[PDB]
Amino acid sequence: VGNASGNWHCDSTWLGDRVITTSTRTWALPTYNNHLYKQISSASTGASNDNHYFGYSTPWGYFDFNRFHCHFSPRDWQRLINNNWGFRPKRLNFKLFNIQVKEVTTNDGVTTIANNLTSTVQVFSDSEYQLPYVLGSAHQGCLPPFPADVFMIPQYGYLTLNNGSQAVGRSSFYCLEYFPSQMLRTGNNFTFSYTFEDVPFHSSYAHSQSLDRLMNPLIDQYLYYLNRTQNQSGSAQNKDLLFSRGSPAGMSVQPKNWLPGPCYRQQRVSKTKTDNNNSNFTWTGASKYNLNGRESIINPGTAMASHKDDKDKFFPMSGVMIFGKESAGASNTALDNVMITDEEEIKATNPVATERFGTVAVNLQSSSTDPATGDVHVMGALPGMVWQDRDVYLQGPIWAKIPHTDGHFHPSPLMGGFGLKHPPPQILIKNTPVPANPPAEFSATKFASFITQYSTGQVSVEIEWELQKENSKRWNPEVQYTSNYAKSANVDFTVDNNGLYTEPRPIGTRYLTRPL
Amino acid sequence: VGNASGNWHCDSTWLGDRVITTSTRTWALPTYNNHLYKQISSASTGASNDNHYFGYSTPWGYFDFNRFHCHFSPRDWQRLINNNWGFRPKRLNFKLFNIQVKEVTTNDGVTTIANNLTSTVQVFSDSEYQLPYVLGSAHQGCLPPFPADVFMIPQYGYLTLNNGSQAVGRSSFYCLEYFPSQMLRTGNNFTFSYTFEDVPFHSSYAHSQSLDRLMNPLIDQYLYYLNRTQNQSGSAQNKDLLFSRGSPAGMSVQPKNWLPGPCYRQQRVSKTKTDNNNSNFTWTGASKYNLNGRESIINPGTAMASHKDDKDKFFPMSGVMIFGKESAGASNTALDNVMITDEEEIKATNPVATERFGTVAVNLQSSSTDPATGDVHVMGALPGMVWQDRDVYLQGPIWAKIPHTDGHFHPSPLMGGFGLKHPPPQILIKNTPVPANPPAEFSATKFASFITQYSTGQVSVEIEWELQKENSKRWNPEVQYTSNYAKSANVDFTVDNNGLYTEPRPIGTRYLTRPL
Amino acid sequence: SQSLDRLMNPLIDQYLYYLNRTQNQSGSAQNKDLLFSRGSPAGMSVQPKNW
Amino acid sequence: ELQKENSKRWNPEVQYTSNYAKSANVDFTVDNNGLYTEPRPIGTRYLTRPL
Amino acid sequence: LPGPCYRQQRVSKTKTDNNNSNFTWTGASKYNLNGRESIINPGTAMASHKDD
Amino acid sequence: NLQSSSTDPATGDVHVMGALPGMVWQDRDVYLQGPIWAKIPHTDGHFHPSP
């Protein structure tokens, strides 16, 4: 009661091929739905057969830290980037301590808050993945990137089989109260350990060679190919068949061994509105998939390059990660209030999201006006493909539960990060309802007179990350993320005079190089 | 919760060649910056390119006892002085107990304070010197020289590379929340031990001989020197060269072996305004150094004597330690509200801050009107120099972190005291934020509704001081600091009818004598 | 990350004083007098340093 | 013998890097005539530490 | 860099080459210590004469 | 001084130095009839305590 339940453990430790990050934040949890489960749907709303949903709202909250900046600090994030070809999660240690349940009452303008010492808050971990996993969707409410900040616990809500604002019979309704949970008073605590499964290192490197440019620029090939089918000689046209062998002179015609990654073309958009086509093609123009009638737009889809060459002003309509900007709005907001990621270090293996994959024949030439070369806007597969995946970001996601089905393909989370069959389980928390003064005679009616109260406390999260040191005999210097040494009124990743932490821009992880 | 976390340990123990002082004070710590870090600078203010700054304000407080009177009592300070040639710090024991976190609320004039039993206060020690050390600067907020007094914990604030109210890229922003800290409830406590590094004893002695007066006043020297170059004989002038050997008759011309300490002349100022020159030369006249454009005045600089001979009414414009006077103001204030220290027992080795170091030749005499003897106002170095350092005072500083660079010189803190590569680390303390009642639906916006509350408690500090007994065969009595045995209405170092502790005047440490 | 002249805490004053003004303003143009003030973030170039 | 850095500096550090921009000549290499050239001198002071 | 230096006045052994007057005191180099200043004998280790 | 449109230079003779990192010097030679030792004054500090 009068004894601390835990200490403030927050720091980072660098150990050769491993790094350990520990974060601690102060949280606050209010009573949700007034201790009630509620049925929710898109019934009697803006409608739209492509936005219908059916689920439930639980009085439970949940802890989430699926954002990198929850663990690594800007400086740490830098050290990782400039010196490591890759990294991965390993172990996990979750702590919940210093439970403070506060009771609140108001009257005639007077609002006084008191301590309900004899109160409990329930906690449990869905370590069997029996409940709907909602951490895969980049939602807000995670641990504040700034340690001194205080946050609220996001409310838990799930969805089920819906048929246009109307459920089916095979739909599932889950009750979190049907789970064994540990009740904690002001002097209690809650600990939990997790072990990440074996997954490939993240690509924190950028290729030094393009898939199409691997051969030796000094030696010819012992292979030949159809050079000219027209045959020049002074007769304008005379058919004939001629062949030639590859050479540094013509690299685009040499026989390769592999092919660029898959491709699902999207529409292009210029940052300068003055350069954009008119009309509102946001929806009617965007690329989307059709799933049981209701079709959904495609966010960062197939890992494709954002822009080509110098044209750094273009970007996929919905093929890039876009983060907020502290003060940014919810609906309006212009460019100067958002941050668009630039997937560029992928142009060496993956195609460009806006342009075509390639060209394919469509007919024969038997006395027919050949050819028929048609543009390809959607590929996928083909034995021999080689591609990079989407890069992760400081404020970007971390992991995502790989849907349990009969099959999948390169289960890399399209939003970036790691795909885990068994990811860090959901940690659910809830304030125990404390009924107010009951009547003086029995009433089998559902009780509804509860004492309004909330709870606060700290929370620690320790994660051990396995690194992968770089081994390159590259002679010339490397590209490194650095801060503008120039004079400035504001220091990047700090606080303003009003005291507010702002993240200047998103940061990738691909700066060091490696031969393809 | 209902059990004391510690006792009131405050006393002194004299043990031959060692003395142990233990102090205990009651502290109070309010929430700073509303749990926020803020960017601060001299942007949009009185300007002045010599007063620009750029730093940050932390919600953290800090414990400081870098003042002698925090440990030694007036009587103790006397015993030390009258009987010891020197002394030094040895061990350190810091205790933090009886944590009392109080919660406060106000409404319609009504202000009631309550106990938040289930609350914590964070504490940690920068034992790796990773954070900006701000104890070197004689700031206020230390432990009250009077035990019964209660004090507040000073707020922590640091500065970084600034370019005229505008930072650079190489500037550093530190977050104290990124440090592992121990959280304490009402029944918890915090202990810490430190070991002072090996440093020379402080000079608690005054020389019995002047550097220029060491030789035997009864014996001549076997060395000669140019006595007269004019040659008298009745021809008014006749060149010639004559030599003579040293003698008690002429001591100022005898060959010595050493030289007085360094010197950086300052302007002189008389206590009697009527004797002072007109105008405001405080700035345009004072001595200062130029560091990257912005120049800063020089406080107690090179250890030089304050006044010479009888002229005890003069003092360096900025070469002496000046303490307040309890009721003294901040800007105005006249002589009768300040206390100026008198560095006098140093005239035997060190020069006078106001006068010149000496005279130096500036040319030859080859048929040229010699000499050229020019005054010296700045010296430093020279093999053979010997000097004393600035004396410490009862209310004066104690230690100071020696800046980590490639080199330094006699790293004695100019303000006096001891120079420590690894000084007593900074002890930072902070009230854990307790969020008020949150909404009923999620909001990823930065939380800002906190329950206002403060904390109080005691704090113990034990320090073992190594002494250095005196060994002098001096026959005649010594000078001792004593109290005016005469009748008086007020007893020195006590309290008035209104109950207020006042320190009559500053006290040096140099009373006993020792042959040079 | 810090300049020798800029180490002190930009939030706390100093318990040390120094000769602030030797001219003394009051409406008599010039009137000598001696006045002192203690260091402050307001005037860092006049605060007592250590090195 | 090296001396690893131990700084709890939050914000990124200044690092020596190569101009990622397009260029006809790669720094610290050889020209068509085969001659090694060193673009410019390089210091060693990029990382930071509290004074 | 060469060692420290505290220049002194020069004197020729041949009086005929010396400047007039008695600069022995008013010309010599000395330090000031608490009012009473004292001449400087062999001070900073400096060479006596140069070249020939 | 500087040279900004100002009649430079200003090269002034030095008659007193001392210190400066990088200095190297010899000490006074001893003589057959010369001194031998000398007690180094006990103070807070000194510099190359060669008599």
Three-state secondary structure along B94-128? EEEEEEEEEEEEEECCEEEEEECCCCCEEEEEECC
Distance of CA A157 to the CA centre of its chain: 19
Contact B158, C29 (CB under 8 A): no
Q: Which residue of F has its CA nearest to E6?
A: F16
Contact A300, A319 (CB under 8 A): yes
CATH code of the domain in which A389 resides = 2.170.30.10
Buried b (16+ CB within 10 A) or exposed e, E3-36: bbbbbbbebeeeeeebbbbbbbeebbbbbbbbee
Of A28, A14, A135, the residue nearest A76 (C-alpha)? A14
Please state, in angstroms and rounded to a whole number, the distance separating the CA atoms of residues B430 and B447.
Answer: 19
Tokens of A373: 């070369």
Please state, in angstroms and rounded to a whole number, the distance separating the CA atoms of residues A53 and A49.
Answer: 9
* Cβ separation B211–F41 shorter than 8 A: yes
Residue E7, chain F, CB below 8 Å: the answer is: yes
Q: Binding site annotation covers A377? A: no
Please state, in angstroms and rounded to a whole number, the distance separating the CA atoms of residues B483 and B233.
Answer: 62
Q: Which residue of B has its CA nearest to D8?
A: B130
Contact B330, C37 (CB under 8 A): yes
Distances (CA, A) of F30 to A44, F27, F33, F34: 110, 9, 9, 6
Radius of gyration of chain C (CA): 14
- The one-letter code for the residue type at B437 is N
Resolution (A): 3.0
Where do runs of H (alpha helix) occur along A216-304? Answer: 281-284
Tokens of B339: 């206390």
| H/E stretch holding A289 | strand A288-290
Please state, in angstroms and rounded to a whole number, the distance separating the CA atoms of residues A286 and A262.
Answer: 19
Please state, in angstroms and rounded to a whole number, the distance separating the CA atoms of residues A318 and A307.
Answer: 13
| H/E stretch holding B77 | helix B74-83
Q: What angle do CA A296, A133, A27 make, to 5 degrees?
A: 115
Residue C7, chain D, CB below 8 Å: the answer is: yes
Pairing of strands B512-514, B121-126: unpaired
Q: Which residues, 6+ apart, have CB-to-CB distance to E33 below 8 Å?
A: B210, B211, B212, B260, B351
Of B456, B460, B430, the residue nearest B123 (C-alpha)? B430
Task: Reduce the DSSP state of residue B18 to 3 states and report it.
Answer: strand
Chain C residue numbers with beta carbons less than 8 Å from the beta carbon of D9 are 1
> Residue holding tokens 């001396």?
D3
Contact A150, A25 (CB under 8 A): yes
Contact B415, B393 (CB under 8 A): no
> Residue holding tokens 């940050």?
B56
Distance of CA A464 to the CA centre of its chain: 20
> How long a stretch of residues is chain A?
516
Radius of gyration of chain D (CA): 16
Of D20, B364, B512, the residue nearest A342 (C-alpha)? D20
Q: B371: cis peptide before it, omega within 30°?
A: yes
Handedness of CA E35, E40, E46, E48 (dihedral sign): positive
Residue A175: is it exposed, middle or buried by C-beta count within 10 angstroms (0-12/13-18/19+)?
A: exposed
Beta bridge partner(s), residue A400:
A419
Residue B49, chain C, CB below 8 Å: the answer is: no
- Number of structural domains (chain A) is 1
Please state, in angstroms and rounded to a whole number, the distance separating the CA atoms of residues A78 and A507.
Answer: 9
Beta bridge partner(s), residue A174:
none
| H/E stretch holding A453 | strand A453-469
Distance of CA B364 to the CA centre of its chain: 46
Of B86, B139, B508, B480, the residue nearest B306 (C-alpha)? B508
Assess whether chains A and D touch, using the rule of 3 or more C-beta pairs within 8 angstroms.
Answer: yes
DSSP secondary-structure letter at A197? -
Beta bridge partner(s), residue A157:
A57
Please state, in angstroms and rounded to a whole number, the distance separating the CA atoms of residues A286 and A320.
Answer: 13
Handedness of CA A128, A129, A130, A134 (dihedral sign): positive
Chain C residue numbers with beta carbons less than 8 Å from the beta carbon of D51 are 1-4, 7
Q: Chains C and D: how many Cβ contacts under 8 Å?
A: 10
Contact B121, B431 (CB under 8 A): yes
Contact B204, B85 (CB under 8 A): yes
Assess whether chains F and E touch, using the rule of 3 or more C-beta pairs within 8 angstroms.
Answer: yes
Query: How many helices (H) and strands (E) would you count in chain E?
Result: 1, 2
Chain B residue numbers with beta carbons less than 8 Å from the beta carbon of D14 are 169-170
Query: Distance between terminal CA atoms of chain B?
Result: 61
Out of F20, F27, F28, the one facing E1 most closely (by C-beta) is F20
Q: Which residue of C has its CA nearest to B270?
A: C34
Q: Which residues, 6+ apart, have CB-to-CB distance to A57 below 8 Å?
A: A32, A33, A37, A38, A40, A155, A157
Please state, in angstroms and rounded to a whole number, the distance separating the CA atoms of residues B319 and B313.
Answer: 14
Please state, in angstroms and rounded to a whole number, the distance separating the CA atoms of residues A137 and A142.
Answer: 12
Please state, in angstroms and rounded to a whole number, the distance separating the CA atoms of residues B84 and B49.
Answer: 47
Tokens of A235: 């007769």
Beta bridge partner(s), residue A155:
A61
* Cβ separation B323–C16 shorter than 8 A: yes
Residue B243, chain E, CB below 8 Å: the answer is: no
* Cβ separation A82–D15 shorter than 8 A: yes
Q: Chains A and B: how many Cβ contacts under 8 Å?
A: 193
Please state, in angstroms and rounded to a whole number, the distance separating the CA atoms of residues A305 and A302.
Answer: 9
> How long a stretch of residues is chain D?
51
Tokens of A184: 């904690």
Tokens of B21: 């002082």
Q: Give one word for A236, left, alpha or beta, with left for phi > 0 and alpha for psi -120 to 50.
A: left
Please state, in angstroms and rounded to a whole number, the distance separating the CA atoms of residues A64 and B426.
Answer: 34
Q: What are residue B198's phi and psi, to 5 degrees?
A: -75, 115
Distances (CA, A) of A374 to A360, A370, A377: 5, 12, 10
Task: Reduce the DSSP state of residue A70 to 3 states and report it.
Answer: helix
**Min distance C24 CA to chain B CA atoms (Å):** 7
Give the method used.
Answer: X-ray
Q: Which residues of F are annotated as a binding site for cytosine?
A: 46, 48
Pairing of strands A268-270, A314-316: antiparallel
Out of B212, B357, B368, the one facing E38 most closely (by C-beta) is B212
Contact B268, B377 (CB under 8 A): no
In chain B, residues 127-166 whose CB comes closer than 8 Å to chain C:
132-134, 136-141, 154-162
Q: Hey, what's the torsion of the CAs at B297, B301, B305, B307, to 10 degrees?
A: 10
Beta bridge partner(s), residue B13:
B20
Out of B39, B114, B169, the one facing A486 most closely (by C-beta) is B169
Q: Binding site annotation covers B377? A: no
Quick count: other Cβ atoms within 10 Å of Cβ A172?
A: 12
* Cβ separation F18–B379 shorter than 8 A: yes
Q: Hey, what's the torsion of the CAs at F7, F11, F12, F15, to 10 degrees?
A: 180
> What range does the domain containing B204 cover?
1-516
Contact E24, B228 (CB under 8 A): yes
Chain F residue numbers with beta carbons less than 8 Å from the beta carbon of E47 are none
DSSP secondary-structure letter at A167? B
Residue B380, chain F, CB below 8 Å: the answer is: yes
Please state, in angstroms and rounded to a whole number, the distance separating the CA atoms of residues A390 and A398.
Answer: 12
**Min distance A103 CA to chain B CA atoms (Å):** 9
Q: Which residues, 6+ apart, have CB-to-CB distance to A504 below 8 Å?
A: A492, A493
* Cβ separation D11–A482 shorter than 8 A: no
Distance of CA A29 to the CA centre of its chain: 25
Q: Which of A78, A394, A510 to mutate to test the interface with D (most CBs of D within 10 A)?
A: A78
Q: Which chains border D (3 or more CB–CB pairs < 8 Å)?
A: A, B, C
Pairing of strands B385-387, B259-260: parallel
